[PDB]
Amino acid sequence: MEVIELNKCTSGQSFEVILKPPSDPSLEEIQKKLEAAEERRKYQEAELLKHLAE
Amino acid sequence: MRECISIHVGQAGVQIGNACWELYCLEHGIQPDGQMPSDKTIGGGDDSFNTFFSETGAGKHVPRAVFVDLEPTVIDEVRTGTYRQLFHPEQLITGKEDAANNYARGHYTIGKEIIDLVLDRIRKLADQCTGLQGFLVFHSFGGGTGSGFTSLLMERLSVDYGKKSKLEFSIYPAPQVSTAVVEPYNSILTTHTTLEHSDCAFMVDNEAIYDICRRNLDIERPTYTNLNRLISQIVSSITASLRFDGALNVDLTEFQTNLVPYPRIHFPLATYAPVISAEKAYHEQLSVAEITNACFEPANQMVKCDPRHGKYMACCLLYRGDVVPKDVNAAIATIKTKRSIQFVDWCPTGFKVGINYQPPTVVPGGDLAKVQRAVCMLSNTTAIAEAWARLDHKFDLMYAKRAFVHWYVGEGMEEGEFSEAREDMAALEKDYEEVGVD
Amino acid sequence: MYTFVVRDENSSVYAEVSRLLLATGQWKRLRKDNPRFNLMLGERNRLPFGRLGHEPGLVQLVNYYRGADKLCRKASLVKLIKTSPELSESCTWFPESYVIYPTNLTDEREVFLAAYNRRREGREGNVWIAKSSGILISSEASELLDFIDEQGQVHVIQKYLEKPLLLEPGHRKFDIRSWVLVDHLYNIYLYREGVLRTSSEPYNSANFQDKTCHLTNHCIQKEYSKNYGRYEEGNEMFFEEFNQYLMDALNTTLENSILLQIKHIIRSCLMCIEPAISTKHLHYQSFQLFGFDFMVDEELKVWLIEVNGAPACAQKLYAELCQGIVDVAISSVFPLAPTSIFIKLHHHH
Amino acid sequence: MREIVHIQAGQCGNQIGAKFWEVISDEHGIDPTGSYHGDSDLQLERINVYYNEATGNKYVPRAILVDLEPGTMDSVRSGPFGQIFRPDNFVFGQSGAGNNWAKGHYTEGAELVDSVLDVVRKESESCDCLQGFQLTHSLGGGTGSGMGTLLISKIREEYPDRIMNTFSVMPSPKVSDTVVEPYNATLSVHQLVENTDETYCIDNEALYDICFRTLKLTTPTYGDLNHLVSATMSGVTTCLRFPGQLNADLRKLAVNMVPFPRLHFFMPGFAPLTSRQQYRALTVPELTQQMFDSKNMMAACDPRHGRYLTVAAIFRGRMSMKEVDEQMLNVQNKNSSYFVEWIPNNVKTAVCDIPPRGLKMSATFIGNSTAIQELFKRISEQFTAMFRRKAFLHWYTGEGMDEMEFTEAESNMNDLVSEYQQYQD
Numbered sequence A: 001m002e003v004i005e006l007n008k009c010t011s012g013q014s015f016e017v018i019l020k021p022p023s024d025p026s027l028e029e030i031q032k033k034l035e036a037a038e039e040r041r042k043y044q045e046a047e048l049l050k051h052l053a054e
Numbered sequence B: 001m002r003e004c005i006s007i008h009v010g011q012a013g014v015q016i017g018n019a020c021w022e023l024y025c026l027e028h029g030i031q032p033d034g035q036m037p038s039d040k041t042i043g044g045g046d047d048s049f050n051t052f053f054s055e056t057g058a059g060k061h062v063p064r065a066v067f068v069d070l071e072p073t074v075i076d077e078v079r080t081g082t083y084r085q086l087f088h089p090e091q092l093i094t095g096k097e098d099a100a101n102n103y104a105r106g107h108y109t110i111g112k113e114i115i116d117l118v119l120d121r122i123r124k125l126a127d128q129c130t131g132l133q134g135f136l137v138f139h140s141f142g143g144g145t146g147s148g149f150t151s152l153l154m155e156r157l158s159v160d161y162g163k164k165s166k167l168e169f170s171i172y173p174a175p176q177v178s179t180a181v182v183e184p185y186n187s188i189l190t191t192h193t194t195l196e197h198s199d200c201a202f203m204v205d206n207e208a209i210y211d212i213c214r215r216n217l218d219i220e221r222p223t224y225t226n227l228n229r230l231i232s233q234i235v236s237s238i239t240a241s242l243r244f245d246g247a248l249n250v251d252l253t254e255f256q257t258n259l260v261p262y263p264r265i266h267f268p269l270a271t272y273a274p275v276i277s278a279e280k281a282y283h284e285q286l287s288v289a290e291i292t293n294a295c296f297e298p299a300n301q302m303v304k305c306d307p308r309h310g311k312y313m314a315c316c317l318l319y320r321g322d323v324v325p326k327d328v329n330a331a332i333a334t335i336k337t338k339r340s341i342q343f344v345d346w347c348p349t350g351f352k353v354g355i356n357y358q359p360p361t362v363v364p365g366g367d368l369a370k371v372q373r374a375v376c377m378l379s380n381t382t383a384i385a386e387a388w389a390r391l392d393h394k395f396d397l398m399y400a401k402r403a404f405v406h407w408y409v410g411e412g413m414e415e416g417e418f419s420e421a422r423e424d425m426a427a428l429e430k431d432y433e434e435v436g437v438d
Numbered sequence C: 001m002y003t004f005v006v007r008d009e010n011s012s013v014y015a016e017v018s019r020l021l022l023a024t025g026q027w028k029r030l031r032k033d034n035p036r037f038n039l040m041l042g043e044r045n046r047l048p049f050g051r052l053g054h055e056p057g058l059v060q061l062v063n064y065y066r067g068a069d070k071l072c073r074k075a076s077l078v079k080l081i082k083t084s085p086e087l088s089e090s091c092t093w094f095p096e097s098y099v100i101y102p103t104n105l106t107d108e109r110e111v112f113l114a115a116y117n118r119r120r121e122g123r124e125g126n127v128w129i130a131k132s133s134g135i136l137i138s139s140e141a142s143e144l145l146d147f148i149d150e151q152g153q154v155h156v157i158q159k160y161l162e163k164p165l166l167l168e169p170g171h172r173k174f175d176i177r178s179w180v181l182v183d184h185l186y187n188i189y190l191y192r193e194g195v196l197r198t199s200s201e202p203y204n205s206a207n208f209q210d211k212t213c214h215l216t217n218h219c220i221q222k223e224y225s226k227n228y229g230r231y232e233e234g235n236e237m238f239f240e241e242f243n244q245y246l247m248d249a250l251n252t253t254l255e256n257s258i259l260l261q262i263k264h265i266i267r268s269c270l271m272c273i274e275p276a277i278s279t280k281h282l283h284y285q286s287f288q289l290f291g292f293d294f295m296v297d298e299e300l301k302v303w304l305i306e307v308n309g310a311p312a313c314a315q316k317l318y319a320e321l322c323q324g325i326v327d328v329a330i331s332s333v334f335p336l337a338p339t340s341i342f343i344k345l346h347h348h349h
Numbered sequence D: 001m002r003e004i005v006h007i008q009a010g011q012c013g014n015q016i017g018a019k020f021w022e023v024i025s026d027e028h029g030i031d032p033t034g035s036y037h038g039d040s041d042l043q044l045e046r047i048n049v050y051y052n053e054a055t056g057n058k059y060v061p062r063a064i065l066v067d068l069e070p071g072t073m074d075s076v077r078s079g080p081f082g083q084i085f086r087p088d089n090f091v092f093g094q095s096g097a098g099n100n101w102a103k104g105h106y107t108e109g110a111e112l113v114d115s116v117l118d119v120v121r122k123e124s125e126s127c128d129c130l131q132g133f134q135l136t137h138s139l140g141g142g143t144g145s146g147m148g149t150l151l152i153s154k155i156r157e158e159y160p161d162r163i164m165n166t167f168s169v170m171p172s173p174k175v176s177d178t179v180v181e182p183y184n185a186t187l188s189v190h191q192l193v194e195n196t197d198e199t200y201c202i203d204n205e206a207l208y209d210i211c212f213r214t215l216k217l218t219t220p221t222y223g224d225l226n227h228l229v230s231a232t233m234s235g236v237t238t239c240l241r242f243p244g245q246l247n248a249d250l251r252k253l254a255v256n257m258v259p260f261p262r263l264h265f266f267m268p269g270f271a272p273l274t275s276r277q278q279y280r281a282l283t284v285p286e287l288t289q290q291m292f293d294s295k296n297m298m299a300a301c302d303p304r305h306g307r308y309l310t311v312a313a314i315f316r317g318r319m320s321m322k323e324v325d326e327q328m329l330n331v332q333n334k335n336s337s338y339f340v341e342w343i344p345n346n347v348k349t350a351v352c353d354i355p356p357r358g359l360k361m362s363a364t365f366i367g368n369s370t371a372i373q374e375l376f377k378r379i380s381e382q383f384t385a386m387f388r389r390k391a392f393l394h395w396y397t398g399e400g401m402d403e404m405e406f407t408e409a410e411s412n413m414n415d416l417v418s419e420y421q422q423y424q425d
């Protein structure tokens, strides 16, 4: 039961008590994912329009 | 002095953000018009509260915050509300139509078209900072914006602000206050793509906040206002060290250093006490031992789970009010002899304690009663993995039938992103079990 | 209308409880994976406790205490007794035991050999028994350890009661099974009816190789013993007969000579782990039936052998006990539209 | 500003649509001349969802009235709230459709459709952020069925990402006009399967049995039947027209009600339904029991014969929201065998403080149940009884259709029936 690193100031204080010792995607890559998904949306909408054109 | 930028995403993030900045202002003596009488340095200063507030020549203290929502009705409340004068219009960003509770819609369809604008508005806040620490990101798991757009924003923030910390306040989905059935999908989709970008995330389960409001505050059917005012007390207790003079958790990096020894396991459990009803005749003021002992009761955890059957990796005690170090240790010793507190062997069995002499501020007319002392315990338990298990199970039930999947595929997302995200969660559950179980 | 689910089809006990529940007309059974339930008759291993108590407007109850395995596991029990100050290492009602890990994997190998060498030098009885979760009784430490190394799981070595109480006629060993029910309020209820699983073979102290007179298990006596069912039907004596025997022979009652120690042991073990497994302030509730096994020596001293977390019942007592489970464990939380069969062991929570 | 464009087509569609605007115009305080005269700001908070605001504070419904003959729409123009409709939004021909799907879809309807879309486009161009469309029509006639689905097809072509909702009256031999109604309904259902996000299946026999057995109307009229549909349409749209802690958005309702794109046919219900013992107060339990009673549902399908994929419930009036949650959880927790277990928490509830006209409180039911397959089975059986003898086909082959298009509609609906069957097991 030890207290360490006791720091005190006008608005409070803080310390540490020890009870026992122990024993990314680049900017270019993110644009590809966004544009890839937008392209799959365009393809699905084109098939719908093509279907409606038939 | 180093600045922190807060980002509120979606309805949950924006409304919770509303309650926090309302509370911050009351805590720092800032009026709704931005003026701060106690601030003796007009139009400048490097005081602790300046990490969250900037200052104009006219003496206005402006939050370092951005509010983002794909639909305008929630942020319109901010524009005409009590604190409409705090923020300027550039800080409030709203689209025309929301993500319809569809992760894919917020992340891809709509997010792609507004992400560059959001980064530009954040870059403007960054340009006012002499030493930006990082970001605090508020959002829900269940919403299409809170889930899908947030994960997109986090990816870009890692690109534009590499060396900056990012912490989260995430609302875990609870059916009692949700008419959305696809939230398990969204929760797991946003956890998978945000995991590598968030240094530390504080999950709040609406189920837990809901039952605290009914049990402690005697609210029969709590509202978002009730829930948010309570959540903003926990948030304030967590961010107090950044806004007030102190030596514990003085910068965002310290949260990871003190609470996250392993990167993927960065979801500390929050526990808060006491929560007393203002309508009560008059409550007996609880002692340091009693409020500290309450930190190990499941009934006041932000996530219902049993820490007795997990292991602790870290543990912080954040006290506010009349608390001296002598009494804290007297309560800790009394609790080690009664409670089942099991630490991982590769971690010290101890507690970092912070004490702020200013007691919790309560919103006038709010639900919470003024207390002489309060504590918030941040502990990294493997027991919080119960929430991942509950959520992953609901995911598996719907995905086994592909229910609602077409809504996501129809927005340009591939079906393989589901299993890819689910397999990551299965690995996350495995990491917890390797650390906690024997 | 109350709802429950059955996730352990092999449980004879809760198969009858489910039968009784449906017979009331006020309980309805659901598929084993339906989450909207009041009561879960859960599985033995890997019961998903984390998914309980998260259904809005449902008070959920389960028939197992999360964390009770610490008491119902051979190795766990030893560790619990030696490390818990409530029980202490000097616990007088539990045989001297040690945890021994096979050499192909802390471990108490050296601690055991020290106490062993002490008994060997002091002319004292030095007969131990090795078991785990396949039993070996020997008086040589070399055989006990070599036997565990040939396996691949943890084991425990404890003093073998060389002076057991022998029923007459027969000169035969036995053990006592006590069923204990712990409800959601952590009341400890001891079923008024116990059973003695007796050996139909005369106890032989100079031959531990033939384990038919040393192991009183109902399956060993009914498979390897040649006198099964001679003295009592199914090698199962009930308290009425056993009590009458203790009076005719030993001029004492079962309550005084044995039952006091049994109730004391049950209380000590269950009160010890109460802070770790209590569901008092938990989002769900638990109860559990336990099977305590006791040994009685010739001095009328009771020793604790083990605790079973999923025990079966004697065929003659299924109806009474299963009905008692519904009364104090299920209906107490989910009431329906005596002279209790249990003995409430009061204690301080 | 989440505007909805309303379209009503044919006799049934315009008479039901007329009453709909009559009911909600009353709820929002709009008089027959479009002038507001209510007393609560709640009435105007979401008023632009269904109304356009003209000069002088005049509110004009965002509705388009379509028919292939003039009679029905002259009645509307002369009806109670006839003057409230924008005169330009009356689009009609003179030929009629002879209860013939082919005439509404391919010949007569095709000549008129472009001019309808011109008005639709005009209404959309004045929407700050168009939320989607709703159509009222029957499936047993010619205009609402044939031209109605033709309009849906062209609307989805021009607004592919907008939500398309229909209130579709399903024919029944007991409340029948002509024998060819199964032909027109089978042909329409396939269109709806492909091109709508939500279809509220309203069965005329269910409406009839309710008026006769429950409301004790000795001789029901179409008028009486339409009163039930008005009240039901007002209930389901309460989410959109008034404020509440729920942020109901057409696409959000669809996202949480439709787990599979083709299974978007709903069973609507309403409670209370009281004969004239009409002043009695209705407790929350009674409201909830009735709302889940099959006799209160308007698809004439027994929900106990299937399982609910999803359920949405709207409670109206000043009541115990706590007591609402209790009774709703009681209904699920007492009959969980009729809800699929692979869609967790699939029963959602919304509350609204403003009750309907003349009621302290009410409850509207929206069920996505696999029992709806019974409704498509009836139609399919009636279709095949005639089609196997090619009876009455000349009315359709005379308009350019071929028998093959009938065989394909037949197979399309038997597939829909099969799809509901696999999710019921």
Ligand SMILES: Nc1nc2c(ncn2[C@@H]2O[C@H](COP(=O)(O)OP(=O)(O)OP(=O)(O)O)[C@@H](O)[C@H]2O)c(=O)[nH]1
Residues within 6 Å of the ligand: B009, B010, B011, B012, B013, B015, B016, B069, B070, B098, B099, B100, B101, B102, B106, B140, B141, B142, B143, B144, B145, B146, B147, B171, B172, B173, B174, B177, B178, B180, B183, B206, B224, B227, B228, B231
């Ligand atoms: N605690 C709390 N939770 C909220 C609040 N608002 C919404 N939620 C929760 O958030 C989830 C719904 O997501 P939202 O944040 O409303 O959706 P969104 O982020 O705006 O995304 P959209 O789909 O575009 O609307 C549900 O689980 C709600 O319970 C709030 O103000 N406080």
Ligand SMILES: Nc1ncnc2c1ncn2[C@@H]1O[C@H](COP(=O)(O)OP(=O)(O)CP(=O)(O)O)[C@@H](O)[C@H]1O
Residues within 6 Å of the ligand: C095, C129, C131, C158, C159, C160, C161, C162, C173, C174, C175, C214, C215, C216, C217, C293, C295, C305, C306, C308
């Ligand atoms: N230390 C000891 N001294 C004397 N006998 C012992 C003993 N340990 C075990 N036994 C004998 O072994 C039998 C019980 O063995 P144990 O309970 O360890 O195995 P087990 O758990 O598979 C049986 P169950 O769980 O069904 O009660 C008793 O009949 C007893 O006679």
Ligand SMILES: Nc1nc2c(ncn2[C@@H]2O[C@H](COP(=O)(O)OP(=O)(O)O)[C@@H](O)[C@H]2O)c(=O)[nH]1
Residues within 6 Å of the ligand: D009, D010, D011, D012, D013, D015, D016, D097, D098, D099, D100, D138, D139, D140, D141, D142, D143, D144, D145, D169, D170, D171, D172, D175, D176, D177, D181, D204, D207, D222, D223, D225, D226
């Ligand atoms: N509920 C209701 N059903 C109607 C009404 N008018 C017609 N129907 C039904 O609709 C079908 C006839 O379609 P109808 O609308 O008259 O043909 P259309 O004008 O060419 O679209 C039949 O099944 C009728 O029973 C009405 O006013 N109310």
Ligand SMILES: [Ca+2]
Residues within 6 Å of the ligand: B039, B040, B041, B042, B043, B044, B045, B046, B055
């Ligand atoms: Ca200053």
Ligand SMILES: [Ca+2]
Residues within 6 Å of the ligand: A024, B158, B162, B196, B197
């Ligand atoms: Ca990073």
Ligand SMILES: [Ca+2]
Residues within 6 Å of the ligand: D111
């Ligand atoms: Ca012509």
Ligand SMILES: [Mg+2]
Residues within 6 Å of the ligand: B010, B011, B069, B071, B098, B099, B143, B145
């Ligand atoms: Mg939103």
Ligand SMILES: [Mg+2]
Residues within 6 Å of the ligand: C306, C307, C308
């Ligand atoms: Mg055993």
Ligand SMILES: [Mg+2]
Residues within 6 Å of the ligand: D011, D012, D141, D177
């Ligand atoms: Mg007609």
